Structures are given as C-alpha cells and as structure tokens.
C-alpha cells in the first residue's frame with residue numbers, strides 16, 4: 158500500500174501555500190498565526206497590489222518564481238485531478254490558484270504593463286520578524302515596452318493560461334478572464350523582447366540565467382491548451398528550434414532540470430506528449446536518462462542513500478521537479494523499460510524526501526518521522542527581537558514545507574534555521590513536489606487527516622505588563638513597569654496602549670497631595686490620579702502613539718518607571734495593583750493594559 162501517506166503530505170503542502178499569503182486574509186483563514194500584512198502594497202504607484210505569495214522565508218513578492226509556481230501547480234492538477242479529488246484537496250488547490258491569479262490580474266493594469274516585484278530584496282532581508290508588522294517601505298517594480306521582460310511576462314501568461322483550464326468547468330467566466338490576460342501578456346512578451354532582470358532589481362535573487370527563449374515555447378504551449386488555437390502550437394514548435402544547445406554539440410540541454418528559470422525540459426516532454434514527434438522524444442529521453450542511467454558515461458550525482466543531487470541549492474526541489482515530469486512522461490512513452498525506469502526513479506526521489514533515506518527522517522516540515530522543526534522562515538519563527546537566533550525553536554509549525562535538504566551527495570543534514578541552504582523553504586520548492594504527490598495519490602492512494610490543521614495555542618501571554626519595585630519606600634511606591642508585545646498568533650501592532658494601576662486611598666492621605674513622577678519613562682507621565690468610587694483611585698500611563706511591536710529589541714517594549722508619592726500615611730498593602738509585585742521583573746496580573754480602551758491584559762478591581 159502507500160509506503161508513505163501521499164494524501165496527508167499533499168494536504169499539508171496546500172496549507173503551506175496558504176501560510177505564504179500576503180494581503181488581507183479571508184474569514185475562512187486556516188492559518189491562525191497569520192494575519193493581514195502588506196496592506197499598503199502598490200501604494201507607491203497608486204495601485205492595489207495587495208495579495209499574492211511571499212516567495213520564501215522572506216516577504217518579497219518575486220513575480221518570476223511566483224508565476225512558475227502557479228504554472229507547475231496547475232499542471233499537476235491537469236495531469237491528476239483524481240489525485241487532488243481523492244486526497245480531498247481539490248478545493249484547496251483551487252483556492253490557492255485563485256489567490257495567486259487574483260494578484261496577477263491586479264498586477265496587470267493594462268495589456269503591456271506587468272508589476273513583477275513588490276518589496277526590495279536588501280531592505281527586506283535586513284529585518285528578521287513576522288510579516289504582519291513589517292516596518293520598512295515596500296517599492297513596486299514593473300516591466301513595460303520601455304523596459305520589457307519576455308521571460309516573466311510569458312511565464313505569467315502560462316500561469317494564467319494553465320490555471321484557466323483548472324477553472325474552466327467551475328467558473329467559466331473567471332477562466333475566460335484569465336485566458337484574455339494570458340493572451341495580452343504573451344503578445345507583450347513576444348513583441349517587446351528582453352530579460353526582466355535587466356529592468357528590475359531581482360538579479361541577486363532570481364536572475365534570468367537561461368533567458369527568455371524557453372518561456373516563449375512554454376507560454377505558447379500553455380496558451381494552445383487553454384485556447385485550442387492551433388497558431389499557438391505552431392508558435393511553440395517554431396520557437397523550439399532556438400532552445401539552448403549544450404557546450405560543443407547540437408544536443409539541446411539535458412544536464413540540468415526544470416525550475417523557475419529554465420523550462421526547456423518541460424517543453425521536451427509536453428511537446429512529445431502532444432505531437433508524438435521523435436524530435437521531442439529524443440530530447441526528453443536524453444535528459445531523463447542523464448538523471449537515471451546516464452548518457453555517454455555522465456550521470457547526475459547520486460548520494461549513497463539514493464538521492465539525486467543536482468546542486469547545493471534546493472537539491473530536493475530539483476529532484477522533486479524531475480520526479481514530477483518523469484511521472485508525466487512515463488505515461489506517454491511506449492518503451493516498457495523506459496516507462497519503468499522513469500516511473501521508479503520518480504517514486505524513489507519523492508519517497509526519499511518523505512523519509513526513505515539513511516536518516517529515516519522526513520524533509521517535509523510537520524510530516525512523517527523526525528521532520529525539520531526550524532525552517533528558515535521569518536513568520537514561522539516568530540522572533541520579537543529582530544534575531545534569527547531567538548527564540549531557539551520556531552514558534553509555529555509551517556506544515557507542508559519541503560526544505561532544501563542535503564546539498565551534497567552524502568545524505569548529511571542538520572536542522573538549523575541559520576543554514577539557508579539545508580533549511581531554506583520557498584513557493585517553488587513545493588510546486589513540482591505537490592504535483593508529484595497528486596500523481597502518487599491517484600496511483601497509490603492514502604487518506605488525509607480528518608482534523609487538520611491543529612489549532613496552536615500561544616507559548617505564553619502575547620501582550621502583557623511586567624513590573625517590580627524600583628526603589629523601596631514608605632511614603633511612596635516606585636514601580637518599574639515594562640510593556641511587552643511578543644505576539645505571534647498572529648503578530649500584531651500595539652500603538653494605542655495605556656495601562657492603569659489602582660490603589661486604595663489611605664487614612665490621612667489627601668488625594669490632592671498625591672504626585673506621580675518619573676526619572677525615566679518612555680510614555681507620558683501623568684499629573685493627576687483618577688477617582689473611581691469610595692477610596693479606589695487609579696493612575697493611568699498613556700503610551701498611545703508608541704509603536705510597540707515584535708520587531709526588535711527596542712520595538713517590542715516600553716519601559717515606564719513611575720513613583721506615586723502620597724506622603725506619611727501611604728500604605729501599599731491595600732492597593733489592588735500592588736498585589737504580587739516583588740523585586741524581580743515578572744508579569745503583573747493586576748495592572749491592566751488597554752488597546753484603544755479595550756482590556757488586553759490583567760484583571761481590574
């Protein structure tokens with residue numbers, strides 16, 4: 158039966174994409190530790206560019222890999238709708254695709270204008286904290302006739318074209334809108350030629366190494382499938398002859414694999430599947446042979462554990478991408494030997510990622526045996542001090558994320574959040590992987606978990622007040638209060654906070670004689686005290702205007718030292734807020750914190 162529960166893995170992969178969402182989240186949000194974020198995206202250009210997915214463990218919205226991710230997910234859903242239907246994940250796949258496509262629509266204000274990036278890679282990567290409280294500015298970047306991007310435009314066109322097929326039967330109106338956008342985007346890409354990275358500051362992250370030739374063949378094919386317009390298939394087969402050859406021969410590239418950059422490999426198979434021409438079959442075969450048996454003595458590096466290691470970065474992502482295409486190809490080819498070779502290779506690579514390896518551990522967060530616990534992801538970590546080192550363990554479980562894994566062919570791996578190689582996570586990492594899982598569910602089955610996602614509970618008070626006696630006295634009480642915002646369910650801002658300290662007026666003390674002073678207060682220092690009833694009074698500290706958020710050592714807290722002097726007769730033992738306050742800084746349950754007038758911590762008299 159299933160060696161691993163492929164349905165559960167796919168179920169968790171869909172949750173991962175939901176955790177990567179940007180913009181205003183829906184009522185039905187399943188990720189309780191995620192809230193609204195990136196709400197002012199596009200503001201700098203007068204457009205609403207909210208929505209879409211955060212690329213990896215950061216908060217930049219990189220259009221090139223985001224679009225590729227969409228095309229791959231749609232492809233898997235087209236190949237194996239049954240896998241998604243049986244795992245009960247089809248509605249989640251559609252919800253994820255609609256989320257990203259709704260953004261592509263927003264990002265395409267007019268036929269030849271495509272916004273391909275929101276956020277600056279360097280400014281974004283300098284800060285380590287939750288998406289909900291990002292403090293930096295997020296610029297919008299685009300490509301147009303003046304500075305084109307055939308690669309990213311053609312990819313987005315393919316993503317929308319491929320997605321339309323998925324929605325065709327459900328929402329024919331939406332499917333039509335997607336196809337219309339895809340057509341315009343492809344014309345733009347075909348007419349105004351250029352590499353997008355020459356126009357937007359994405360070179361250091363997602364540089365178009367292969368160029369755009371591969372995206373022109375890839376986009377044309379998908380448009381053919383979405384429209385049925387023969388001209389597109391003609392266009393694909395024409396552009397195909399200009400694909401990159403390798404080193405010294407006329408053999409088309411067969412030593413790498415399909416990913417966000419080079420789609421050559423996918424077209425080999427897609428066209429072979431579509432036309433049946435020996436031309437495509439020869440290329441597809443050479444490539445898949447290099448990954449399995451080798452061609453001319455050369456073969457992709459293999460670990461003793463049986464993992465295909467193509468490169469240091471996203472090793473598992475690469476193996477997973479190849480595994481998916483191998484499964485698609487294995488169905489079209491007639492040769493029984495090649496069919497078995499490719500199919501078995503695919504299953505072996507996915508199984509390795511799910512736990513069938515020398516470490517006996519899953520490489521999918523929150524899944525299987527001994528999974529990674531500390532993926533390199535800002536929001537999942539939940540740091541409130543702008544530090545990748547604290548807290549030690551991630552505060553949230555990023556269910557479903559496939560990590561980079563072993564970067565070398567030695568099966569070695571250490572679950573370290575600071576290791577951006579082994580523990581990196583990203584939308585494209587789960588694309589081919591998910592599609593492969595859909596195929597495997599259809600073939601081997603598996604059952605999804607009835608109660609998923611689990612509801613996480615906070616690791617402590619999120620927003621609270623700590624206090625301690627600063628200086629002992631008899632005619633006064635001097636408190637050292639600390640307001641803390643270490644929220645993570647979800648991380649939130651506290652910019653309208655005030656707190657009250659209640660006390661009981663004592664015999665012989667005139668309230669007109671009570672003074673509240675401070676030698677250090679990050680908030681306001683009040684002149685009066687407030688009378689409730691009888692001899693119950695309170696001092697109110699006003700911190701409104703102060704942005705207290707989990708985004709740094711100074712940002713997450715406000716220190717407030719305050720002395721309430723009442724003169725002889727002052728007696729704190731009958732003061733409500735005084736209960737439990739000692740000489741060590743600790744949570745003060747009787748000091749109440751208000752967020753715009755609404756109690757958030759402590760209990761009042």
Ligand SMILES: [Ca+2]
Nearest residue numbers: 367368371418
């Ligand atoms: Ca390319």
Ligand SMILES: [Ca+2]
Nearest residue numbers: 661663728729
């Ligand atoms: Ca008193």
